[PDB]
Every structure is written in C-alpha cells, then in structure tokens.
Design a protein around this ligand. Structure first.
Ligand SMILES: Nc1ncnc2c1ncn2[C@@H]1O[C@H](COP(=O)(O)O)[C@@H](O)[C@H]1O
Ligand SMILES: Nc1ncnc2c1ncn2[C@@H]1O[C@H](COP(=O)(O)O)[C@@H](O)[C@H]1O
Lengths: 182, 182
C-alpha cells in the first residue's frame, strides 16, 4: 500500500504550459487517491503548482525545506505542514523517511540529483521504495534512452533499472508504483 | 590552475573494452600532467583501472571511501592515500574539498548521482569548480541531448549548463576544465 508519495519537480515552471498541466494532474490525482504529497516545500514553479493542486483537491501536503533556501524558493504558507531542516542532505533523508514512493515530474538539475540520489539508496539496500517518471511529451525520452543504455553496457543491473517505473498518466504510474516488487 | 581532479566512474568495467581504454588514457594523462587523482578509492571496475593507470605513470592518487563499502568495492591497497570516511555524504563532500575539477567517465547510477550532486553544489553557489564528461563513443550522447533539452525548456539556466564541459580526448577536456570561467 502507498500512503504517501514524494514528488521532485522543477522550481521553474518550464517553457510551455504542458508542465504545469502535468503537475496539476498529479497533485489532484494524489489527493483524490487519499495519498499524502511530500515535496520540497516551495511555492515557486512546478513545486508550487503540484502542492496547490493537491491542496485544492483536499489532500494532505508536507513540505521539506532547508533553512538556507526559505526565501529563495518561498516556503509555502498553506501546507498541512512545512518542515524546516538543517541542509540539503537532511531534506532528502527526511523526504525519503516520509515517502512510500518517489515521482519525478519534469525539472532541472535539482530534480535530477534528488532522483538519482534516492535511486542509489535503493541500489545500496537502504530502502526498497519504487521510483517513477511522469512523462510529459517526450521530455524524458532521451534520459530513458540513456538509462537503458547503462543496462546494455552493463553499468547498471536490470533489477536496479527496474526500480524506475514510468507513465504519462498519473493513475497508471501510481498503479505501477503501488504494485512494484524487489 | 588545476592541481587535483576528482574522477567518478563505474564500479563495473562495462560491456566492451573501450571503457577501460578511456580510463587508462585519463589516468595516464592526469599523472603525466602533474595532477593528483581523487576518486572513490575502489579497486573494482573503471575505478581500479583509472587509479592503476595514474599510479603506473607515477601520479599521486587519493581514494575516498565510506567505511561501509570497503569490502564491497575493495579498498585499493597501493594508493598514495586511502581516506576512510563516515558515509556517502562525507565521501562526496571530501572529494569536492580536495578537487579543483570533476570528470565523469562512463559509469552507472552512482557515477551519475555524484555528477549531479556536485553540479548542484555549483548551482547553489558552494563552489565554482568546473565539471566534465569524458565521451566514450556515443555513451553520453543521449544524456547530453537531455541536458540541452533542460535548457531549451528553461529548467536549467545557460550558465548552469555551461559548468559541464565535454571531450573525447583527455588532453582537450582537461584544457577546457582548466580554462573554464563563471
Ligand atoms: N543537492 C541538493 N539537495 C537537495 N535539494 C536540492 C539540491 N540541489 C538543488 N536542490 C533543490 O531542488 C529544487 C528543484 O531544482 P530544479 O529541478 O533545479 O529546479 C531546487 O529548488 C533546489 O533548492
Ligand atoms: N549516494 C551515493 N553516494 C556516494 N557514493 C555512491 C552513492 N551511490 C553509489 N555510490 C558509489 O559510486 C560508485 C560508482 O557507482 P556505479 O557508477 O553505479 O558503478 C559505487 O561503487 C558506489 O559505492
């Protein structure tokens, strides 16, 4: 059973409206499903959008933010809870402690570093929580091509690759995450 | 001036000999250039290969390894120094403290998480040390395609993208790293 889902997403909104539409769909879907949203606690970009959609639909939202970037990404004032921690490592360790699964929406280097960090923690045996990509147009196509290449070239085992699910529908991706097994 | 270079690379050797050839070329080139190699301190895979090539050519090598994975990746016994630290975060923080620049050889999820983590630290203003991709065949082509897309879609600023240089020649990449500017 999933009870809460951690979402990583851009602090920018992105160059076209499709990104915000995907964030809205996902926030709304999490709430409708009974799941708590865990996220970086910002009000900027897709972070703000996914929290707002979760809240508009009645969902619980917990934001996790380092002290050092409260003003930069604008700590969201209308969350169920906003947890302010000591630094970047603490933030990711806490989001993981509260989540049953992880979803990456489109984002930048921060979204990607979070995804990869948490993926390695599964690789190293610290958790067995599944990760997912919410696909928006062909945003992630070249990343998936690259990750599959890592398995062909034998830098990543198949079972480690298989921790990352993917879907363009929030419902179908959440189903894949809820059913996935080590 | 570069005095020391941190290398991230696979703990696997990879499915074909080209990867080991690139690691050998890079280790040998670092040593010939007078640069200290900083790396994860393993004797497995491309990690072992790049340290051995640096050492065979007379270079200094410093390995940085968490306590918890000494047996797993085989702490290298013939380094200038092997520093054993408390955990994963400590390892990356220490490699960064000792390096003037970062190079990613081909690798898996660990190589990628390290690259992305250190890249964000530049993004957040903690350092201004350049990063580089050593290109081996078209290994990184789809990653570069994806990263460029992040800038087109406005999830990453151009100046943040520009912290990552790239080359197939160790000499040309090291020149790009030594000359790069914020
Ligand atoms: N090393 C890191 N650890 C934790 N959070 C980070 C790190 N780097 C960036 N972030 C955050 O991730 C969020 C999403 O980043 P981005 O996808 O680059 O817009 C940013 O607002 C950053 O504050
Ligand atoms: N989160 C992490 N922090 C530091 N090192 C890591 C992490 N995940 C994996 N590694 C290391 O990076 C090395 C290269 O990994 P790979 O590229 O997956 O073969 C591995 O041997 C791991 O011990």
């Amino acid at each position: 059973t999933l009870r809460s889902v951690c979402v990583f997403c851009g602090a920018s909104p992105g160059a076209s409206p499709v990104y915000q539409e995907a964030a809205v769909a996902l926030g709304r879907h999490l709430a409708e499903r009974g799941l708590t949203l865990v996220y970086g606690g910002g009000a900027v970009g897709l972070m703000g959008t996914v929290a707002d959609a979760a809240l508009a639909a009645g969902g619980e939202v917990i934001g996790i933010i380092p002290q050092s970037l409260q003003e930069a990404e604008i700590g969201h004032k209308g969350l169920t809870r906003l947890e302010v921690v000591d630094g970047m490592h603490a933030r990711k360790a806490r989001m993981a402690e509260l989540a049953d699964a992880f979803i990456a929406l489109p984002g930048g280097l921060g979204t990607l570093e979070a995804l990869f960090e948490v993926w390695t923690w599964g690789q190293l045996g610290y958790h067995a929580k599944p990760l997912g990509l919410l696909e928006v147009n062909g945003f992630y196509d070249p990343l998936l091509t690259f990750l599959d290449h890592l398995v062909d070239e034998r830098f990543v085992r198949a079972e480690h690759r298989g921790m990352l699910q993917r879907g363009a529908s929030p419902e179908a991706l959440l189903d894949a995450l809820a059913a996935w097994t080590p």
